[PDB]
Design a protein around this nucleic acid. Structure first.
Ligand SMILES: Nc1nc2c(ncn2[C@H]2C[C@H](O)[C@@H](COP(=O)(O)OP(=O)(O)OP(=O)(O)O)O2)c(=O)[nH]1
Ligand SMILES: [Mg+2]
Length: 868
DNA sequence: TGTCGCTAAGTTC
DNA sequence: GAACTTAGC
């Protein structure tokens, strides 16, 4: 009778069906010897509300306190007579529950005997401010059904659940192959120590042509690659994809080149030719249903792909839209809106993976378009079909098949990108650590995960969580740096996860810090037992430490090393975000005083570490909120390491948990300003041998707002300034290279691609206030003006400053590379590139190096030294 | 409908 | 002296 299934996604509707939460997942079947999708609809998820008894009777807040004691019986009478009749509440169940409270609300006793009252969801809902003559507050009024079913039953992320006495549904309700009905939340439990099962992953790529007359989008080709056993606890499978399906729709106006039949016949029989977008979308929905994917993945799928598909279904009215999800409905969710919540609910029960958001979360790249990601991760070359060609692609069957194959190659690229970053296993692991639903975790953002993590930590520990909600404080300290160049060995010491360590050491928790509703609250007493937040932060720190130690294992494959690095970075970001959510003003657990205390202790620890290092009779040169750089004044490497170990031990002697480590050793240092330096890191190899690797932190060469010309010039200049050659030869080499680049630029030898300057928008092009035409925004608008895929917010736009005789300010002349390559009346701005893009970079780089000053650089570059 | 924190150099108007 | 952006912790 028991029914055991592994759950992935949960969907709820707080209005359509009240007190009903759906759990989608996989279940084992011996007949097919396979896992099949199923949906269990936990019904009768009774709403719960906790009423806080008062200390003494109050005459409806009019006569103030009267001194009459109030007990649980009086509270029950009051709720049964007045509140129940007033709010049209028929049946309710009451009990006394002793719970503790520590959150941002006044006059709520720390540990009190609340009266819990449960009533059916369908009945009306109490109001948040409801106050009677016997109680002063009601908690949990608006707690969503899904949240109650998750926290109460202790489910934390995808896992195996056991159901007692399942009931077959009277009529079909979901599109899955197995349906169960749970009549109460108490019949569902979680089973531990089992292997996660394989899932079905479908990567989709759609090529669309924008309608000329109607100024809208009409899909023309859709390809997808599906794997039926994509694991979630082992390495990605090779080959990544098992099978695929392609569909192509002839344009409403254009016609096939009298050879489409023969071309398709000689190519393959796995491609579906659709006469319209209606048939194409129907075929896509049928294939999705038959495959029943569990993770649909793509690029900008939340933003532009799923929304386009749903809108096209609505416009052409393709029947049975609900198949694009898992549930059965008739009223599509309203489109538009901010983010992709509407698009997410439009395919409920099917996790959605936008590789763009995952890549943003994990890796850092200059641009996030598909081409840049492909060139940066898989190290390939991605062919981009011009938007004009696609409309003209349906003129030769060869080019039609080429377009279809390009879509297929994009799909394969997306799947490989997903595999390499280990998006799915990492997402599942983070979801299990936090406790939220996987579909939300894969959508980015850290506030949700931290909120759910603390929610679990406090629910399992007998606390009452706060109701969902309907420069600020002193932060890090950066030491004043002694700018300049250093040739001896500079030792960089750093602290290990300084903020989580501070939280652990000083018991900075929710249940210990006696706040008072912008001062810094006093530190908690040591004798107090560990709180709720420190325990979770320590668990996360321990997981990160274990991953690091595993990385320390010698003879590890480079790819596995990259995977471990990504996982460790994700865990560090999760700990940092757990700290940060204490400062978010729009957070369930906003605790600004706690974040202020954490930052204040960090500043204190940094200042004390600096004091100790200085008292040790050495020289300090820099530090950013947890790190310190020391001037060794030595040359032998062994002495450097011995001094580092000595100082590390001396510093660590004063902290119970905090750890200081040798962040690095530098052979040559170039410290320009705060948060800007370059150095030659020294990695030992054995027998006293030490290899060198050039590391730049903060320079203008490592930012996407400078031309590649300036990037290469600064790279060479820094390479010289850091080497061991004598100063005179370094200066002469710099002069020769600068003259060479000047001659090349003046003669136009430099290629076009080295001129682009990239900037990322924050809002949409229109929403930007018309404050002049700040280059990127200007160029952005042009891209939107032309008939191509739009450039929405959070997109990298590349522009090149050119000349057209406009005689305007240099900023206003920003243009697009395609425009310049197309227009015959525009040309590159040589003086701009050699004056405001290269010279400032080299001048900042060579500021403390004797022998070079701004005038000399300007002269050597070929610029006129008049205005310099 | 949610969108981790603060700090700081650098460009533009 | 304010905005905007992109690095750094
Ligand atoms: N809220 C928030 N705080 C951060 C973030 N990044 C860094 N911090 C803060 C908290 C960290 O404890 C502190 C120092 O960070 P580090 O870069 O030195 O990393 P960490 O010390 O955790 O590890 P490490 O041993 O130095 O490699 O800066 C972040 O992304 N968000
Ligand atoms: Mg650190």
């Amino acid at each position: 009778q028991v029914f055991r299934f592994y759950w992935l996604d949960a969907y709820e509707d707080q209005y359509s069906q009240p007190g009903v939460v759906y759990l989608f997942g996989k279940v084992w079947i011996e007949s097919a010897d396979a896992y099949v999708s199923c949906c269990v609809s936990v019904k009768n998820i009774e709403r719960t509300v906790y009423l806080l008894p008062r200390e003494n009777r109050v005459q409806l807040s009019t006569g103030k306190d009267t001194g009459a004691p109030v007990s649980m019986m009086h509270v029950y009478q009051e709720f049964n007579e007045a509140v129940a009749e007033k709010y049209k509440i028929m049946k309710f169940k009451s009990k006394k529950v002793d719970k503790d409270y520590a959150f941002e609300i006044p006059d709520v006793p720390a540990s009190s005997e609340y009266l819990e009252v449960r009533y059916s969801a369908d009945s009306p809902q109490l109001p948040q401010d409801l106050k009677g003559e016997t109680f002063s507050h009601v908690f949990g009024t608006n707690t969503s059904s899904l949240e109650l079913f998750l926290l109460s039953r202790k489910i934390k992320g995808p896992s195996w659940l056991e159901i007692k006495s399942p009931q077959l549904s009277s009529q079909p309700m979901s599109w899955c192959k197995v349906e169960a009905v749970v009549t109460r939340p108490d019949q569902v439990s979680v089973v531990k120590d089992l292997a996660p099962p394989p899932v079905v992953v479908l990567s989709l790529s759609m090529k669309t042509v924008q309608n000329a007359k109607t100024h809208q989008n009409e899909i023309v080709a859709i390809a997808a690659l599906v794997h039926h056993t994509f694991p979630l606890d082992k390495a990605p499978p090779q080959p990544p994809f098992q099978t695929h399906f392609c569909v192509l729709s002839k344009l409403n106006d254009c016609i096939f080149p009298y050879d489409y039949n023969e071309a398709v016949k000689q190519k393959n029989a796995n491609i579906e030719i659709a006469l319209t977008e209606r048939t194409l979308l129907g075929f896509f929905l049928a294939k999705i249903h038959k495959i029943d994917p569990d993770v649909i993945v793509g690029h900008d799928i939340y933003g532009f792909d799923l929304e386009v598909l749903l809108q096209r279904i609505n416009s052409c009215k393709v029947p049975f839209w609900s198949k694009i999800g898992r549930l059965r409905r008739s009223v599509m969710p309203k489109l538009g809106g901010r983010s992709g919540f509407a698009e997410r609910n439009a395919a409920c029960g099917r996790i959605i993976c936008d590789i763009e958001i995952s890549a943003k979360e994990l890796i850092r790249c200059k641009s996030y378009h598909l081409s840049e990601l492909v060139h940066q991760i898989l190290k390939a070359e991605r062919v981009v079909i011009p938007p004009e060609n696609i409309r003209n692609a349906y003129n030769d069957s060869v080019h039609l098949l080429y377009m279809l194959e390009n879509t297929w190659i994009d799909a394969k690229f997306i799947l490989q990108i997903m595999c390499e970053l280990n998006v799915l296993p990492l997402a599942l692991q983070i979801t299990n650590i936090a406790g939220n639903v996987m579909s939300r975790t894969l959508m980015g953002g850290r506030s949700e995960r931290n909120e759910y993590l603390l929610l679990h930590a406090f629910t399992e520990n007998n606390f009452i969580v706060p109701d969902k909600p309907v420069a600020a404080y002193a932060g890090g300290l950066v030491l004043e740096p002694k700018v300049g160049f250093y040739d001896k060995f500079i030792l960089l010491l750093d602290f290990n996860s300084l903020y989580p360590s501070i939280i652990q050491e000083y018991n900075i928790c929710f249940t210990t810090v006696h706040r008072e509703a912008d001062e810094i609250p006093e530190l908690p007493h040591s004798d107090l037992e560990m709180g709720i937040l420190p325990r979770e932060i320590r668990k996360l720190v321990e997981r990160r430490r274990h991953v690091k130690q595993l990385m320390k294992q010698p003879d590890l494959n480079p790819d596995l090393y990259l995977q471990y690095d990504i996982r460790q970075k994700a865990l560090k970001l999760t700990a940092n975000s757990m700290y940060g959510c204490l400062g978010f003003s729009y957070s369930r657990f906003y605790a600004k005083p706690l974040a202020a205390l954490v930052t204040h202790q960090g500043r204190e620890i940094l200042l004390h570490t600096k004091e100790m290092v200085q008292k040790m009779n050495l020289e300090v040169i820099y530090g950013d909120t947890d790190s310190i750089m020391i001037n060794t004044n030595c040359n032998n490497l062994e002495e450097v390491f011995k001094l580092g170990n000595r100082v590390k031990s001396e510093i660590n002697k004063s902290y119970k948990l905090l750890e200081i480590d040798i962040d690095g050793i530098f052979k040559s240092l170039l410290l320009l300003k705060k948060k800007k330096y370059a150095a030659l890191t020294v990695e030992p190899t054995g027998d006293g041998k030490y290899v060198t690797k050039q590391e730049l932190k903060g320079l203008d060469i490592v930012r996407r707002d400078w031309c590649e010309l300036a990037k290469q010039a600064g790279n060479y200049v820094i390479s010289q300034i850091l080497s061991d050659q004598p100063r005179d030869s370094i200066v002469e080499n710099i002069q020769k290279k600068l003259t060479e680049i000047g001659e090349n630029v003046t003669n136009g030898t430099v290629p076009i691609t080295q001129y682009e300057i990239n900037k990322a928008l924050t809002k949409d092009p229109q929403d930007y206030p018309d404050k002049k035409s700040l280059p990127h925004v200007h160029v952005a608008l042009w891209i939107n003006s032309q008939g191509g895929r739009k450039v929405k917010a959070g997109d990298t736009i590349s522009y090149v400053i050119c000349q057209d005789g406009s005689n305007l300010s240099a900023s206003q002349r920003a243009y697009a590379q395609e425009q310049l390559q197309k227009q015959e009346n525009l040309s590159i701005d040589t003086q701009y590139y050699l004056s405001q893009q290269v010279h400032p970079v080299v001048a900042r780089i060579c500021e403390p190096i004797d022998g070079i000053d701004s005038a000399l650089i300007a002269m050597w570059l070929g610029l006129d030294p008049s205005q310099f």
